[PDB]
Each structure stands twice: as C-alpha cells, then as structure tokens.
Amino acid sequence: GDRICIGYHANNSTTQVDTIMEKNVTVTHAQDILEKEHNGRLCSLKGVKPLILKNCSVAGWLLGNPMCDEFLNAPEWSYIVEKDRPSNGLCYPGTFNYYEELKHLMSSTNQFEKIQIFPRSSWSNHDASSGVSSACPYNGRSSFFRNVVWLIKKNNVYRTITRTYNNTNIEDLLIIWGIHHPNNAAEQIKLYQNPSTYVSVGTSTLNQRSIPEIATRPKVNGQSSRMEFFWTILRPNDSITFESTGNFIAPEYAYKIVKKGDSAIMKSELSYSNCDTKCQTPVGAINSSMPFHNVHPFAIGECPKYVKLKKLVLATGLRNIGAIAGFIEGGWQGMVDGWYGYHHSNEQGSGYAADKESTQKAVDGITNKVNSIISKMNSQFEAVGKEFNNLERRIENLNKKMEDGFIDVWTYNAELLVLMENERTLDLHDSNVKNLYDKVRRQLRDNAKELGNGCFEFYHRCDNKCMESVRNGTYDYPQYSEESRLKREEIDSGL
Amino acid sequence: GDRICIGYHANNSTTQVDTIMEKNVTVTHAQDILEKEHNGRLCSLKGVKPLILKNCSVAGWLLGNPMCDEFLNAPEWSYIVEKDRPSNGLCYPGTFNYYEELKHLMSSTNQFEKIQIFPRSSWSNHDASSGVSSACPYNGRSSFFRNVVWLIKKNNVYRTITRTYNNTNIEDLLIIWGIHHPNNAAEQIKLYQNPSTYVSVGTSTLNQRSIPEIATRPKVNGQSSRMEFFWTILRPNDSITFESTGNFIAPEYAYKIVKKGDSAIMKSELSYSNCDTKCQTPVGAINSSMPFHNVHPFAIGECPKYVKLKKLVLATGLRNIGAIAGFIEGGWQGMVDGWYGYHHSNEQGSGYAADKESTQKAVDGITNKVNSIISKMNSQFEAVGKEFNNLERRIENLNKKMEDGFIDVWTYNAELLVLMENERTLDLHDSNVKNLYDKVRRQLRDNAKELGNGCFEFYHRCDNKCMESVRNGTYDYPQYSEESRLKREEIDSGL
Amino acid sequence: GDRICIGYHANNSTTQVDTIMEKNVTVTHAQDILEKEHNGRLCSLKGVKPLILKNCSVAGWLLGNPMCDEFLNAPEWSYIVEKDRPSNGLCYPGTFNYYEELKHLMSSTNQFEKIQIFPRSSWSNHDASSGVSSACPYNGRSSFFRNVVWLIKKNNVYRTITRTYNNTNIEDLLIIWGIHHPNNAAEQIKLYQNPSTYVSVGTSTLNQRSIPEIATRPKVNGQSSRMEFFWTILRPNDSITFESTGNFIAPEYAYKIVKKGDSAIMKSELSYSNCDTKCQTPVGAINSSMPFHNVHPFAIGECPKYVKLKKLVLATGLRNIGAIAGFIEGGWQGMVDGWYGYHHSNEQGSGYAADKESTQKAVDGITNKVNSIISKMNSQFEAVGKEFNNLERRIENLNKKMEDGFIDVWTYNAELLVLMENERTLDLHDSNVKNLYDKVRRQLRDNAKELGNGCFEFYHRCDNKCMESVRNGTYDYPQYSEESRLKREEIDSGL
Numbered sequence A, B, C: 001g002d003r004i005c006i007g008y009h010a011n012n013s014t015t016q017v018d019t020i021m022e023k024n025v026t027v028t029h030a031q032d033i034l035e036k037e038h039n040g041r042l043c044s045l046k047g048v049k050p051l052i053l054k055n056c057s058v059a060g061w062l063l064g065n066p067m068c069d070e071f072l073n074a075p076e077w078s079y080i081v082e083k084d085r086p087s088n089g090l091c092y093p094g095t096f097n098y099y100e101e102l103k104h105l106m107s108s109t110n111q112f113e114k115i116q117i118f119p120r121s122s123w124s125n126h127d128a129s130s131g132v133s134s135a136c137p138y139n140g141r142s143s144f145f146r147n148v149v150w151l152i153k154k155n156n157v158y159r160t161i162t163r164t165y166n167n168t169n170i171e172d173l174l175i176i177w178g179i180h181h182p183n184n185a186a187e188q189i190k191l192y193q194n195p196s197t198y199v200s201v202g203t204s205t206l207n208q209r210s211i212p213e214i215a216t217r218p219k220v221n222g223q224s225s226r227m228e229f230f231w232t233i234l235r236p237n238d239s240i241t242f243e244s245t246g247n248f249i250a251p252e253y254a255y256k257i258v259k260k261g262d263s264a265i266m267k268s269e270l271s272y273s274n275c276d277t278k279c280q281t282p283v284g285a286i287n288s289s290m291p292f293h294n295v296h297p298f299a300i301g302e303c304p305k306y307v308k309l310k311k312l313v314l315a316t317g318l319r320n321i322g323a324i325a326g327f328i329e330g331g332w333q334g335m336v337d338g339w340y341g342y343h344h345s346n347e348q349g350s351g352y353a354a355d356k357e358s359t360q361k362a363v364d365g366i367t368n369k370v371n372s373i374i375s376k377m378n379s380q381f382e383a384v385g386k387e388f389n390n391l392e393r394r395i396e397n398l399n400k401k402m403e404d405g406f407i408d409v410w411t412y413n414a415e416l417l418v419l420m421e422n423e424r425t426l427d428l429h430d431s432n433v434k435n436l437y438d439k440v441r442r443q444l445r446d447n448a449k450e451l452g453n454g455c456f457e458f459y460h461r462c463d464n465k466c467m468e469s470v471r472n473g474t475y476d477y478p479q480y481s482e483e484s485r486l487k488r489e490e491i492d493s494g495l
C-alpha cells in the first residue's frame, strides 16, 4: 500500500568491458577507443603527396640510375616510399658511403631543387661521353648515372683536374661524387693512363683524398669493377674543391635542400591511389578519429597512439542488470532518460522519474574522465623509421629493443588505465544508486518503512506532489509527522 | 536469547603483505611471486649444452689459437660461455676488426660446421710451414693459429697470389683472414721480399685492398709486430677472391652457419656441471616457476621477469584479525572452509557455517585476478647481452641506460600493481563481509534486533532449519511475521 | 533536546588538487612536490667548483689553443662548462678524431695533472720554433697550440724521428698528437723536404701509421691546410712510440687522469657566480628540497626527478566543505585540532571534541603514504649529456628518443600516481567520518534517535561525561537502557 523505489538504468546494450578483476561484463554504455581497420592504400598526407620511388632505391634516384625517373618539377613531399628490396639502385656495382646517415637526413627533408654545378660539356680536357656501361642500360643501350659524369682520358692523357664550386645559394647543398675501382692495372691505364691517381676534395669541414683500390672481384650486373660514392653537405657561403688525376666520378647536379620538417621514409610494397589521409602506415591509411590503433607501429601524420592489443574499450555506464522491484534486484528497462531515478507508486501513480541532478553529475564526471585519460597519453612514444648497414647490427637491435620497449610500456599503461578506470566507473555507479537511496531514507525517517529490496512504504500518505517532495530534497517530515506515527502504532497493535 | 552472526576467516598465517598505504599487514592467505634463489651452476638449456670456451675468447676459438680446442663434432649449442677476461685470445698480438659486431652475430647462431676452403698443402708457390711464433706456443714449441695460414716467401720469392673460393653450399659462410704488420723494413723483406705489398679481397658486396702499416711498437707476448684480422659472410652462390703479393694471412677453414635462433654469449666465471635448467644466468640457474626474479638481469631461456626488489608478495585473503563475537571484532579462528560465513546460536545449535556461494565467488575472482596480473607482464622488457670496444663508449652507455631504464620502469610497474591490487584485495574482503551482513538484515527486518557487534537477535524464533532459511536467501518474513511483532511489543511494555 | 554530531575539519585553505575524475577540488591540507624555480646561475656542487672553459671548447683547452687558459693548478672539478658554440677551438683548422668519444671520457673525469713527456727543447735534429701560424695568434703575434709541437725541417733535412715514452705513472695518460695536411706538393717539401712521409705510433693496443692527404681546400682562419689530431690512453706500465719522417705534430704534454667519478659536460651560456648548490642545470641551480622539478632535463647533482608538468600537488586532508549541523552538510570551521570529531550538545555543553585516535590514525597513514610514493621513484630515469658528430645523426636521434621516452614515461607515472592516490586520499577521508558515525550508532542503539543530518538525539539523557562515554567506545547501553525505552514509548503515545 503505496511505494517508492530507488533504481537504475537498463537497456538493450550488449557491448562488453573488462576490469582488473572481471572480464566480459555487459555494460549499458561503453566507448571503443582502439582503431583496428585501415584502407589498405598509400595516400597523400593532408594534400601533400608522397614521393613514390617505385622499384628505385634512394641512391638510384639521387644518382640518376637511368632506370629511375628524376623529379624535374622539384615537388615537395609528405614522406618518401621505397620498396623493401628496390631493384634499381647502384646499377654499376659498388658502395655508397654513409648511405644510412643520408637516408636519415632525407627523413627531415621535404623538398629538393636539383641544380647544375659542373655541366657535362665543360670538361674540355677529358672525355665526358665514353663513360657508359652495359651495367646501366637505357632503352637497351649502355648508359650511366645521369647526375654524375664518368670522366675518361682524352686522346690518351688525363690532365690533373682542379675544379671548385662556390655555394652562392642560401640553402644547404647535397653533393655526391665517386671514384672508380678497376679490376687490374691494365684497365687502370686503359681508362686514366696515370698508374697512380687520387680523388681529393675539400671544404671548410671536409678533407678527403681518395685512392683507387684495384682488386679482382666477382661480377655484379656484368661488372667486376666497383664504383664507390661519397656525399657531403656544402653550407651556405662555403665552397668545395675536387682535385683528381683520374678515376674521379664527377658531380654534374647537386640538390638544394629547400624545405625541412616532419618527414619519413616508409618501407612499403604498395603503389599510389587517388586518396588522402591524416595518418599513413606501410600497409594503409587510417581514419584517425580514435585515440589508439594497432594497425602498424610505423604510422606517420596526426595519428592515434599505437598499442599491441586486440581490444581497448572503456565503460561509460552501469552493468546491464528482467530486473524487478528496487535496485537490489537489478536495472529498470523502464527508465529511459537518466542513469538513476525512482518510481511513483501511489494510489494513482505510474512511475519511473529520473534524478536529473545526479545523472548529469554522472554523465559530467565520466565524459570528463574520458578525455582526461586520452590526453594522459599525449606524450606517448611514437616510433621512427631508421636503417642500418650489415656492420651496424648491435645498434640496429638496440634501436629495435628501445622501440619495442616503449611500445610494450605504453601498451601496458593503456590496458591498465582502461581496466582500472573501468572498475572505478562501475563502482561509481554502485555508489550513486546507494547514495540516492540514502538521501531519501535520511529524508523519510520514522514516517516510512524500508523494505530491503530498495523501496520504501509510507506510514503517512503522499500524493504525486509529495513524491516530488522527496525527489527534490524538499520533503518535510512534520508536514506528515503526526499522521505517520499515528498510523504505524496502529500496526504495532494491528492485526 | 538466540543469535546469528556475520563473520570471516582467521587462521595461523603470519605471511605479511604491503599496500600503497600500509606495510607489514598480516594476511590469512598470500602468494609469493618473486624467485630469489639460484642453483649457482652453469647448466644445459632444455637438453642443449652450452659451448664453454673456458679460458679462451671467441677470437681464440674461431682463429684456432693453439691453446684453444676446436669443436670437431660441430655441436649445436644453447648459448656460449666466455670468461670475463679470457686468457687465450690473439696469442699473436693485434686487432680483430668489427670483433663486437661478430660476437653479436654469434648471439643469433646455434651451430657451426668448419670446412676447408684452402688446404695448407695447396700453396705450392710459397712457404706454408715456417709461419709459426714463440707467441703462439703448443706443447712448448712455436705454433700458430690453426685456422689461418701465415704465408712466407718461398726460396726468396713471393709470387702474387690470386685464389678464389666459390660458396657452393646453401649456408652462410664465416670467413676470416688477416694481414701482418712488421716492425721494420728489414723484416718486411726478410719475410715477403716485395717491399710494397697488399692484401686485396673481393665479393659481390665486399671490396677491400689492405696495406701493411710498418711501425715500431712495444712487445706483446714477445712480439712487437702485429696481425690484424678481418671477417665477412660469403652468401650462398657468391664467391670470394684474395689477391696478395705478401703479408697475407690466409684462411684455411671457414664456418658454415647451419642453425640460427635464440642464443647468447654469457659472461661467466663458472665451469660446467651435470645439470639442466629452463633459465640460466651468469651466476646460476633458476627454478622457473615464479613469474618474477631478482637474481641477475641477464637471464636467458624461458625465464621469469627480472625486477629490482627484495620482495614481491600478493595478498590472497583477509587480514588475520582472539577475535570475538561478530565481524566488527575480527576473524573467527573457528571457521575453516570458506572465507565468509555465519554461526548458529539457537537453543541447541553450535555454529560456524560458511557462505559457500560468496566465498567461491571470492576465491574465483582473486585466483582470476592473480593470473590476469602476471600475464599483464608477458611483454616485459628482457635484457640482451652486447659488447663494445673502447671507442664505442657513448653507445655502450646508451645501451646500458636503456636497459636500466626499462628494468626500473617494469620494477615500478610491478611493485605498484601488487601494492594496488593488494589494497583492492583487502578492501574487497571488507565489502563481502559487510554485504553478507546486508543480505541477512534486508531479510530479517522487523523480526530481528541488530546488535552492532555484527550479530542479530530474533524477536520471533528460528530453529536450525530457519537458520538455513536465512543463510540461503530463502527466509520468509510472514512465516514468522505475526509471531515476532507480538514478541517485541512485549518488550516495549516489558520489564 | 540534547544532541551529538559526527563532523570533520574545515579551514581557510584554498590550495587545490586534482584526481583522475575531478579537477580543481579545494582541499583542507595539501603538499606541493614540484620544484619550478631556479636561481639562474652557475654554482659549485657541494664545495667543488666547475671548470668554466669560457669561449674555449674542450679541444681548445686540451690542445692549448693560445687563446685558452691552462689549469696549472690541476684543480679537481664537479663538472665542466662549455658554451654552445665556443669560439676558441682548432684555431688552426682541421679535425679531431673521436672527439665525441673523448668529451664522453671527460664526463667520468674529475681531475687532470698535465705532465711533460717530450720537452720542446729536446728535438735536437729538427726545428721546434718556426712552427707557428697567423691562424693561432697570441698578443697579435703568430703562435700555436701550446701543448703540441709543430716540427719543421732543420737546415733543410727532416731526420726520421723515433721517440718513445714509457708511462711510469700509476694513472692513465691522455696523449694527443697530430699530423699536418698541406695544400700542395711544394709546401710539403718547403716544410718537411721528404716528399713521402708518415706518422706512425704504437702501444700495446694502438697501431696506426698516418699519411698526409695533400689537397686543395678553402681557407679557414686564413689557412687552406689542415691539421688532424688523434688521441689515446696509455695504460700504467705501457709505453708509446712515435715514428715519423715528417708532418708529425708532436706531443709535449700529456694529461694524468688522477680522479674519476660522477661528472658531466654542461652546455651553458652562463658564467660563474659566488654560489653553491646541490643541483645544477644549464640555466641555473635548484633548491633541492622537493622530489620533482620541471626546470630542465639535464640536471646534475643530488637532484629532484625531472617531469614535464606545470604542476604536481598531492592531497593531504579533506575537501573544504558555512557548512552546518552534522557531516552530511559539510565541514566544521569550528573544529581545530583533529580531522574527525564530534560536538557536545547537552543542557550545558558547548561542543567540538576531536577523535584523536582516528585522526592520528589518519595523519599517520597519509604522512606514511607520502614518502612511500616519493621513494617509489628513487630509481627514476636521470638523463645524461652526450654529443654526436654530423655523421652520427641516427644514433643522436636514438639517444634523444630514448631520453624523451623515459621522461614521458616517468612524467606519466608520477601524474597518475598523484591523481590516483589523491582520489584514494579523499575517499579515505569520506570513510573515516562515516565509520566514526557507525561506531557511535552501533553504541547508542535503541537509546538514541538518528536524525539523518549526521547527528543523534538521545531518548535517555547524557551529561558531559556520558558524552565521553560514547566518544571513548566506553558507552554502556544498560547504564541507560531502562531510562531510554521508557522515554520514547512516551513519544509513541506522546503529543
């Protein structure tokens, strides 16, 4: 005979959530925060295309391997794409000193302008056209690196070369040259006649006199000789001088470094698509709305933080209890707008009014706890691409263990935070429904019988508007004091 | 006159446990998870012995220093043991280029097969037997590295050598050679006659022409001359060519790399024992049943995770309160099977029945919380052995700071987890005993007086089987409604 | 008519504190733990001054660039200060091999003693005074590095040099020498006459024969020639031998390494002040009383742990609620010594007595939780100074990413701990005031009416000393049993 109940929300949700102590708990509202799909393509970064080297490697492109395409337009890029094992590199076999350190410098570089420092037609005293090879073909012919000039003896003499370029520009200059290492002393004379030659080069900060290491080697790409290349950055206002009496592989073209910034060299086997992203990975681009992904560790752009987990979901509301009577027995499918509320049961009432003011105290402190934990990972470890030669293995592994180390550390930090605050989310829900109960029972005191299912029966009487009397905190015990006590002492001596 | 009490377990345990806020709290059940003893021996890893180099270093073994023993059987190993300062290395003094990079490659290597590429008896045009030294003795005689051939002028001439080996095998080949650096120009001619010689060597990817650096040096192991060694890996189907006019230290034997995998070079001063482990450390092996140890950071095998702590113990049950009456006053030594229960006190009852269904709801969620926190460290940072030469100090310290850095990070992660979930374990125990109380008081309502020690006295009466009426959740208030109220209004007007 | 209330402290505090779920909560007592001011000066470390190189670089000092000052006193230092771009280095242009590895060795070094190994006046067979240059001026004259001797042909001959130094000392010796690289073959003969010369040097472990790389270069500091320097550490009982026929830049002075320990090279643009600290950073010293700072990551000394946060404050007491009646309504400005207490309201009482025994159970477990969380970061990652040449960029970035990585990791660990234990601090306060309430209501049972504001009215009566009866846990219900029940059944049938 006349009731009021404390209860909480329940709905059709089946999304599940974990804590430290429980797995797979059905909750009423949750929020996935792990991105796990990608679009499988290479795309532009916010309107800036990558440089897709195709089957060419970085050396192939910079040296001008005849099978590689130059970028005459001087386009800026957002990153650079190189296949894992590019097929078009040093078509003429050899080595490329500090190649990896250079590939690294590329990673902070967004735009080149190729310029001419020594035109091919200016080597008056030597042969600048016979320097081609079956190893570097072009349309079936013998050709050569398009940016360096293989210099050959003219009419049986190699006059000593001394040429200098003064960097009048304001940008750094990337300059590449090399030296030729023949098979045998016959070939040395056949090509440069001087039996004993050097390639010397000087700047403010660079000092190197290179000599030819004649030796007998197996044939790569048809050649048993070798060409070894060098590089350096000529600073603004500085100058560079090459002196050679032979074997010199001369620069024609240098690269003006005209834009630096966030960039990268991505190893990927994919080609281009009409496509834009904010976050790009080697196997595809990412819809960067979630704060965490597990697609690939080497993502670049404005990206979610990478974590090694199959799932990462935060709890937002109650557990999903149908559930009857008061809150002791579970949730109310019949309460729709609010997480915690009550239920009119008078001689005319229907029920199910929510306590707006502790549900928007709730949806306030959880919506604020959600961003506060995301931002807690703003400074999470983003991994960076880097390469290493076959005698840099210790530092490669070092680099690999430090990037795995942090990925594991932040994977754990994120799993634990979600698990911990998920437990703190559900326990919070258990606290407000119990504290809702307590405000009404510290209101209705003697005047009301508390049933232990989560509901109260009144010894006095209360219409619809005395039910708002107790829902508001506005209830007045003396406004029914005398009535109520007169009506339970009648049960004390009742039936 | 007639009672029932809520209470919890208490026993003879004295194992202690810590939380964030308290130290040294006596608990009823706990679980150590830190392994801190080792067996003090070098053992096999799961049936696969290590390679114990004894007083020999890795170069000593690979070069065949006469005092080192070859491994003619070609045994596979689980790891390699090298004393800290091995005594048998380059018995003939010198250097060993990229030694550390090679020791590193050994760490991913489990089996060699030594093979012959250039037999000593095939150097028809030079002396292959006079090349021995008092620096490399064998049975008191002068001997030499057993795997390289010191080549000497024959009958006063050193014909130019050009020999090539074609790697017809399917495995990688480790090949070692060297060059001799004499004291003075007299000795250069005394041994090789050509005053100006080189050691050239080529592969697909290797190009090096080495020249002798004659200089005056102090005598190591009786010699003031030096031998400098080189190494390289000859790929399957590739070939290698040495050309020398003198000073060449020639390979006889190469190492077929026939098994790669998890391996390591352990620095340890211990010798072998008839002994097997699953986890091996430089100072001894570990009984790998616990998920954490503190024995040594450089453990290899299926190992617990290393942490810098003297202790790591998780709480499993209650605090250990003797403790009297209801739960307000502490635990019941008298309750044996269950963590939470009650106590029959009727006109014939004895007491102490456990609530099976919230104790195996308890021993369920703690046993599940224990493995869930162990596995939370599956991806914990395992450290790796690595070495560095005396001009690689910056990267040595880098490597040392990154491995300490992660050990400190995961030591903290583990101490905090245990401390935090230990507090969440004990607070949980406090929640079920209080919630056990609440189910019975929301059952027995008016019909019962609640004492505040944790017990209830009944205004009606209840036999043994009405005590199971309230222990089951099966109690019926109207089944004693009228009786009980009639019997406290008799106390309202009682004595 | 006659009352007692449960309540808690409230005061004039406005210091604010955050948790996982709330920001900016006003608390009654807190504790800042983040140091964020510095004194802006370079100071001594605990009585040991730094070595302030001023405008000179480390090479400038060690080589004796005429513009640098030697440290004749051989002072020990606590660290070394070098401006970012020092102006006084290789006044004679060139390179300094493994410079960074040497700067690193300095970081574990606290005291040099310069000693003489080859006095300038002992080069009887060559010119030891003409070796000066307009590039290395001193008082406007031409001078030279004060610690090496530029050796010149004597009277048109350069006799081959063979000199050796035997390290009879017990300390390690730092030894520096170099070689001269002329512009052209004329200058080579003009200075050393031998057209083909070397600089050879040997120790137990060092073997290097250096040759001059003549090339045409741009002029630095007026010179287009180059001097290239080398260094090595001569061990106790070992000896070193230089052999040259020219271009040798000879050591005069070596550095006895006489004290090693904690040291560093600090990059700072500041000069010295009459000043001592326990913790020094490049932009100033720190009052090292707090356990965390955010002043600069490269602090040295007994220092707080560096974290990237604008604020780090722990909660110590209650939230700051004026707040009326019992605890339901907030704090009591009127309670001064204790965090939790009560309030005499009898027919003569005043009120406000604190429960000493659960407030010093409180100020005990929070003061113990404060140090326990500080010490939890004893093993926090301290960063270390290190440098890298322009072809060591990959390992520079590696080093930078690993030191940022740990700073981010420990910044997060510390923000989360403070936020988490701040929530555990306030919830604890909410637990004791509610449990204080429960001890008194489990004491005064029937004999007392519980109002729901946090207070109780007595059906019996209780003077001042029956209020200590209930504050002590010493209350006796039968000592007012009969009285109280007789006096609420009078209200049951009352007005």
Ligand SMILES: *[C@@H]1O[C@H](CO)[C@@H](O)[C@H](O)[C@H]1NC(C)=O
Residues within 6 Å of the ligand: A011, A012
């Ligand atoms: C799930 O419940 C919501 C109300 O909470 C309702 O609007 C929606 O249509 C329901 N969906 C299904 C499939 O039942």
Ligand SMILES: *[C@@H]1O[C@H](CO)[C@@H](O)[C@H](O)[C@H]1NC(C)=O
Residues within 6 Å of the ligand: B011, B012
């Ligand atoms: C400790 O208590 C257990 C029962 O919980 C009992 O079986 C065991 O014998 C006791 N041991 C000692 C030494 O008292």
Ligand SMILES: *[C@@H]1O[C@H](CO)[C@@H](O)[C@H](O)[C@H]1NC(C)=O
Residues within 6 Å of the ligand: C011, C012
């Ligand atoms: C703040 O309160 C303390 C007592 O808690 C008092 O001693 C102090 O004088 C007060 N300060 C101000 C500025 O009101």
